[PDB]
Short mmCIF file of C-alpha atoms in Angstrom, two decimals:
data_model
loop_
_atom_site.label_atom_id
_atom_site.label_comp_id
_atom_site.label_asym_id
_atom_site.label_seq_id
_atom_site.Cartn_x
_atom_site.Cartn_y
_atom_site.Cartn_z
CA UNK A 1 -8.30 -9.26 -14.68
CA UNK A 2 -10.22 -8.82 -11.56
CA UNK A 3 -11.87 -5.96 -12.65
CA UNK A 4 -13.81 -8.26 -15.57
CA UNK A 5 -15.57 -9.58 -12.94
CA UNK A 6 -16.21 -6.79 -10.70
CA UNK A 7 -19.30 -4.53 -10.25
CA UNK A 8 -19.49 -1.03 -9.99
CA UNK A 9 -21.33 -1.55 -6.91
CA UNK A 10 -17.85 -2.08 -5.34
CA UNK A 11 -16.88 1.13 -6.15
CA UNK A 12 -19.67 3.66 -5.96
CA UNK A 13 -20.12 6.34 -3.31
CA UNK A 14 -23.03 4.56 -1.94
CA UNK A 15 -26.41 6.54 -1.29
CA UNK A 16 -25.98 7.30 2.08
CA UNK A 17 -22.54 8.89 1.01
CA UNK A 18 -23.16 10.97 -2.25
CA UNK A 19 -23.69 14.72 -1.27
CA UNK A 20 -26.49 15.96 -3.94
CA UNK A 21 -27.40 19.46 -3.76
CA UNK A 22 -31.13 19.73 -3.92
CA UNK A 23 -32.76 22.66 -6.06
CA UNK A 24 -34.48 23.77 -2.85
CA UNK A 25 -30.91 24.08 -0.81
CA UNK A 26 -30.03 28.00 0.31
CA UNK A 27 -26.93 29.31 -1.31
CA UNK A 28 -25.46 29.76 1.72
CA UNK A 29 -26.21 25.39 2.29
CA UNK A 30 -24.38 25.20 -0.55
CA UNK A 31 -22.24 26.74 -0.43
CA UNK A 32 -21.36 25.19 2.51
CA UNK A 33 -21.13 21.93 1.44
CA UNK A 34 -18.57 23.08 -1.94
CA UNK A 35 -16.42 24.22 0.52
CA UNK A 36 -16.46 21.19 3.60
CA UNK A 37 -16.04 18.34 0.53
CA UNK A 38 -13.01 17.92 -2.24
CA UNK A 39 -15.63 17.84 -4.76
CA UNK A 40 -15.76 19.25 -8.40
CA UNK A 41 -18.90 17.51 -9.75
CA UNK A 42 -22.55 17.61 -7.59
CA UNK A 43 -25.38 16.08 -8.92
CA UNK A 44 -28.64 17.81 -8.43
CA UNK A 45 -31.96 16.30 -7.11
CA UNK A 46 -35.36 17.29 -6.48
CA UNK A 47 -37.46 16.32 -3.38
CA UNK A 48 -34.71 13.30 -2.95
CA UNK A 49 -31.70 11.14 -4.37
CA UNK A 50 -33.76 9.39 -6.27
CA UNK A 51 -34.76 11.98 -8.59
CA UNK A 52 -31.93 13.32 -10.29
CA UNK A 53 -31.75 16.31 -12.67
CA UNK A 54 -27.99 16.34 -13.63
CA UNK A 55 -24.91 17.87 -11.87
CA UNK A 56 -23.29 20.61 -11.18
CA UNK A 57 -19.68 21.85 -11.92
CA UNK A 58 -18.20 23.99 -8.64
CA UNK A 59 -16.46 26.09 -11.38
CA UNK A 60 -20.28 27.07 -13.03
CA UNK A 61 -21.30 27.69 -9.38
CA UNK A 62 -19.01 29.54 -7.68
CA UNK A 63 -18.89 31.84 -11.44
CA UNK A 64 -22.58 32.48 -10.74
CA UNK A 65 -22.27 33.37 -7.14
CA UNK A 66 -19.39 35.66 -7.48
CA UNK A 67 -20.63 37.39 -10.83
CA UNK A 68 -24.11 37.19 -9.48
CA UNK A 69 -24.79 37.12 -6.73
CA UNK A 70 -27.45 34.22 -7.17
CA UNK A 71 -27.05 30.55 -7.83
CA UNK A 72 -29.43 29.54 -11.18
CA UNK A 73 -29.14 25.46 -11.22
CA UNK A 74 -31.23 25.32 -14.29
CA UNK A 75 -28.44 27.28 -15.93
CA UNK A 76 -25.34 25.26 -15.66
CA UNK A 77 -27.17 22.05 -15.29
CA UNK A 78 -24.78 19.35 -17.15
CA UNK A 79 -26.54 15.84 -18.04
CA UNK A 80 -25.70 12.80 -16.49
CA UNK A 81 -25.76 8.83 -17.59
CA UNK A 82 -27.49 5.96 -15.61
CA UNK A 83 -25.35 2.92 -14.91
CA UNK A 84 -26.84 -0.59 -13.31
CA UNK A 85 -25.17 -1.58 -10.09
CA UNK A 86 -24.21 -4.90 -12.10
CA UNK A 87 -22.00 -3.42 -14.36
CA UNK A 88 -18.66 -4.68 -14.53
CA UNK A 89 -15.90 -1.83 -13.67
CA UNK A 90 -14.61 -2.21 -17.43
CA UNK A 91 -17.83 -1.97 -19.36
CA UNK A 92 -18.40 1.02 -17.37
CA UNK A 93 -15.34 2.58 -18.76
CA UNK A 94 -16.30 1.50 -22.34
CA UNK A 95 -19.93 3.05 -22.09
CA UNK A 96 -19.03 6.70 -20.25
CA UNK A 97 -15.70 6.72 -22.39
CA UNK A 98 -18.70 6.26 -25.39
CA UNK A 99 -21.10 9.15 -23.83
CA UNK A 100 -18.49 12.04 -23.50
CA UNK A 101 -18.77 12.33 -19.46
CA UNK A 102 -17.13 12.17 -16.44
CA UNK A 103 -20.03 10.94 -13.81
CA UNK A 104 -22.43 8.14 -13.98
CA UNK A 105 -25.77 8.38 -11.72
CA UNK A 106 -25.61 4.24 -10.50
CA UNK A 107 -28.90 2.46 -10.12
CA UNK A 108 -30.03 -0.41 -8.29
CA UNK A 109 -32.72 -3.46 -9.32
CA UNK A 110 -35.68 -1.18 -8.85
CA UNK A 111 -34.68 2.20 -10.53
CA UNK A 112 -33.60 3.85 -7.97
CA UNK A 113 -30.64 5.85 -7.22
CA UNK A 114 -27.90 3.35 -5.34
CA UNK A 115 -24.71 5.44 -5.74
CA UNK A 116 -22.45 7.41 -7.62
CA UNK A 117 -19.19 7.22 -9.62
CA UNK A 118 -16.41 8.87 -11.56
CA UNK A 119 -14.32 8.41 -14.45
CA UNK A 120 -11.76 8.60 -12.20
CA UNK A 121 -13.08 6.25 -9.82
CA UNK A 122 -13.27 4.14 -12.19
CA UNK A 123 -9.25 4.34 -13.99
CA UNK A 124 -8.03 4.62 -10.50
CA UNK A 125 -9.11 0.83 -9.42
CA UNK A 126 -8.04 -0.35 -13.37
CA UNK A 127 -4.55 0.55 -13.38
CA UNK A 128 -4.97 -0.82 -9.74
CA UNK A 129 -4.55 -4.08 -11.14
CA UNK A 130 -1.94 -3.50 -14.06
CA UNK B 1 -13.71 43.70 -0.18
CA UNK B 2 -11.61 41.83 1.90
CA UNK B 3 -10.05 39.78 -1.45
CA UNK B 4 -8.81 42.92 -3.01
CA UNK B 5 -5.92 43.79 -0.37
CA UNK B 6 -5.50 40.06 0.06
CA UNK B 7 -2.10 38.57 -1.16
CA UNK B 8 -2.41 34.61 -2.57
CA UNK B 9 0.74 33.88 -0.60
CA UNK B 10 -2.48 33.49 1.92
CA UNK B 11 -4.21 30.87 -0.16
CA UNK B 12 -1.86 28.89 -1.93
CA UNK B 13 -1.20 25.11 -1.20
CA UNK B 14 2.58 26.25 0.27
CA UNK B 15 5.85 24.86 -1.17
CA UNK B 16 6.11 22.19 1.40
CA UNK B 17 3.15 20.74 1.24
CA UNK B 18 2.36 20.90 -2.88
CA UNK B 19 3.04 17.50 -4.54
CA UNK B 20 5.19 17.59 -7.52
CA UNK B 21 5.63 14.77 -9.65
CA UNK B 22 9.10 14.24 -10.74
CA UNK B 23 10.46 13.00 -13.93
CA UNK B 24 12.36 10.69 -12.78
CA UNK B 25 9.71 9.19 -10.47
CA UNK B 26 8.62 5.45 -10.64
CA UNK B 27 5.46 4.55 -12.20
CA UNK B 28 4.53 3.13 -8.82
CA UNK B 29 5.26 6.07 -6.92
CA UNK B 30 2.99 8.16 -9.33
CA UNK B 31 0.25 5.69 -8.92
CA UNK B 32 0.89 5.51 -4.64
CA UNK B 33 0.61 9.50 -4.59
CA UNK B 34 -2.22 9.76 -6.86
CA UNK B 35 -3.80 7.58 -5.01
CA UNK B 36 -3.63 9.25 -1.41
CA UNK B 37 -3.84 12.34 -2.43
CA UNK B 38 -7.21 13.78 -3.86
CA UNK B 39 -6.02 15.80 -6.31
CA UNK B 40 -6.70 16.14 -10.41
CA UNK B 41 -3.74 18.46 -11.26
CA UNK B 42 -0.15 17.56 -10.73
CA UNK B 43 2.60 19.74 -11.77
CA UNK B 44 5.61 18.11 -12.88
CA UNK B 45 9.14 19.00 -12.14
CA UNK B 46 12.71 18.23 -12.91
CA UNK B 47 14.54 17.15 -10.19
CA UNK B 48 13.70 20.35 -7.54
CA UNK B 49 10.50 21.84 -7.16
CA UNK B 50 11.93 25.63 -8.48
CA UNK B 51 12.44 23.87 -12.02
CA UNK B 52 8.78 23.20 -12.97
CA UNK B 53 8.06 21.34 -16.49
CA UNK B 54 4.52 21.92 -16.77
CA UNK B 55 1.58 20.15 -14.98
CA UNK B 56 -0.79 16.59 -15.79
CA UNK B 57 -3.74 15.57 -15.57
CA UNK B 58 -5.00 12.62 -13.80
CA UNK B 59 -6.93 11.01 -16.47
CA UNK B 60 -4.39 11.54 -19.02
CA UNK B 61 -1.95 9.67 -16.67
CA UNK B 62 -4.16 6.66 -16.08
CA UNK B 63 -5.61 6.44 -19.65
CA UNK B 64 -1.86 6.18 -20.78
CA UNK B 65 -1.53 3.75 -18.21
CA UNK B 66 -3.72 1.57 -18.96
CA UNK B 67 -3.71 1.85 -22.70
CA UNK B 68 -0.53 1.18 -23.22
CA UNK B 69 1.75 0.27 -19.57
CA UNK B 70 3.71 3.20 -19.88
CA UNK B 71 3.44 6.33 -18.45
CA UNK B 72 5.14 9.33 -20.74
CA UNK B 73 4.79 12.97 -19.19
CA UNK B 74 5.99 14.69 -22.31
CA UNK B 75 3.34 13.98 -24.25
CA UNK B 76 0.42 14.86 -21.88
CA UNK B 77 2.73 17.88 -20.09
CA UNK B 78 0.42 20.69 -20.03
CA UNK B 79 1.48 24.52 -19.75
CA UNK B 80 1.17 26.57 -16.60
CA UNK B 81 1.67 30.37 -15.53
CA UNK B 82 3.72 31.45 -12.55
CA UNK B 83 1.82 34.31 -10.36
CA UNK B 84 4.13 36.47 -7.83
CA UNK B 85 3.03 35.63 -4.11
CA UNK B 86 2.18 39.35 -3.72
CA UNK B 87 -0.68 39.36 -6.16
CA UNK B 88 -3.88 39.92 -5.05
CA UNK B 89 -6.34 37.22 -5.08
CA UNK B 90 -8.43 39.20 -7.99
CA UNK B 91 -5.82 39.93 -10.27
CA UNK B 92 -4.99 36.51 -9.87
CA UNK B 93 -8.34 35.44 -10.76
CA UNK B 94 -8.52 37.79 -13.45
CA UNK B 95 -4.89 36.71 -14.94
CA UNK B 96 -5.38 32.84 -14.87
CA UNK B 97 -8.98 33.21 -15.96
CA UNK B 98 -7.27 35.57 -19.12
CA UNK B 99 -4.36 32.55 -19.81
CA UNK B 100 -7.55 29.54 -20.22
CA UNK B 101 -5.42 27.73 -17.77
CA UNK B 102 -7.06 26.02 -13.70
CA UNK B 103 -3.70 26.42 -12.06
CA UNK B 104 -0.71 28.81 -10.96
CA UNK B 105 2.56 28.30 -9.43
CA UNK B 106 3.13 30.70 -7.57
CA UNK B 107 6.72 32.54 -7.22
CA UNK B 108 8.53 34.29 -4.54
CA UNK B 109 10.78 37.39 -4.26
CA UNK B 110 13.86 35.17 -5.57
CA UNK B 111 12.42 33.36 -8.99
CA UNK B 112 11.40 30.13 -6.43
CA UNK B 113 8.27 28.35 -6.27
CA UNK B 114 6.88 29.58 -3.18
CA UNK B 115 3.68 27.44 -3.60
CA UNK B 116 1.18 26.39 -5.90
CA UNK B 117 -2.74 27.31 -6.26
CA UNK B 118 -6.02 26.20 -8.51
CA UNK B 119 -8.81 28.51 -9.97
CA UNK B 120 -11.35 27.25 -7.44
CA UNK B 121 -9.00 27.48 -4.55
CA UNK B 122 -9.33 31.08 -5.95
CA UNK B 123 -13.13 31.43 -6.29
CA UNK B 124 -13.79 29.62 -2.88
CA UNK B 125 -11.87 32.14 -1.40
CA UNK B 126 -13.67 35.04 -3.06
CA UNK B 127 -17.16 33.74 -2.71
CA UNK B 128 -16.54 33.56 0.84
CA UNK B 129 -16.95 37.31 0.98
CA UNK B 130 -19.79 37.22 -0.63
#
């Protein structure tokens, strides 16, 4: 019931908190960063966080690296879906359930980026309160 | 270079420490460990963790959760391959990557699990000598 009312904002890796991997980043930044966090999806920015260009799958990556030996972004980009801040936890089930993905870009009152959040995220505080 | 004499007894999440959902496990206690730990793949066993069943998948556990108040493992049991502990990480890479499967249990000199490990467990580790 609780979760009728509630926002994503509640729930979000806030700004501060989301690791994007910029196109600009080294490989071996990246790299880096894959291996530090317990992270399967990145989103990818230019310039800043604000300016997202659609994630990243560490599978895609670490497949270019090794078979590569370069990292193409461009390549394995994936696309993402914007979600207000205001959305209630269950409609934002409903609509990524509807779009086919696992990771919603969320965005505050002026269009900017305020956080990120996961499908999983998202079922995890749901059957929370069943 | 380093990968190719390199056993993934080395790599794998060891016996101890892998998390195996049982069959006969409460819905709660699926839900607590789920929770904690920060993990998409569970493998499932039957009463000891030498008798594996298969393994889930987060989502599918929380979707049929939520849908309909009941969790069922049968019917979202996916398959998995057992890998000897004496592989090398690239024939390991090479075999899972042949099966379409994300994740090996991995088998000691006796027919036991000796430990579980993931595809990207498996190309983090050979990126690194890259």
């Amino acid at each position: 019931f609780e979760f009728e009312e509630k926002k994503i904002r509640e729930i979000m890796v806030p700004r501060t908190d989301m690791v994007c991997i910029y196109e600009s980043d080294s490989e071996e930044k990246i790299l880096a960063i894959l291996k530090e966090e317990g992270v399967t999806r990145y989103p990818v920015c230019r310039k800043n966080k604000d300016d997202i260009l659609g994630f990243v799958h560490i599978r895609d990556l670490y497949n270019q690296k090794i078979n590569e030996n370069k990292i193409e972004l461009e390549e394995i980009l994936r696309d993402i879906i914007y979600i207000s801040e205001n959305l209630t936890i269950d409609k934002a089930l409903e609509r990524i359930r509807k779009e086919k993905l696992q990771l919603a870009i969320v965005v505050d009152e002026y269009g900017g980026t305020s956080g990120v959040v996961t499908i999983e995220d998202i079922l995890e505080e749901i059957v929370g309160e069943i």
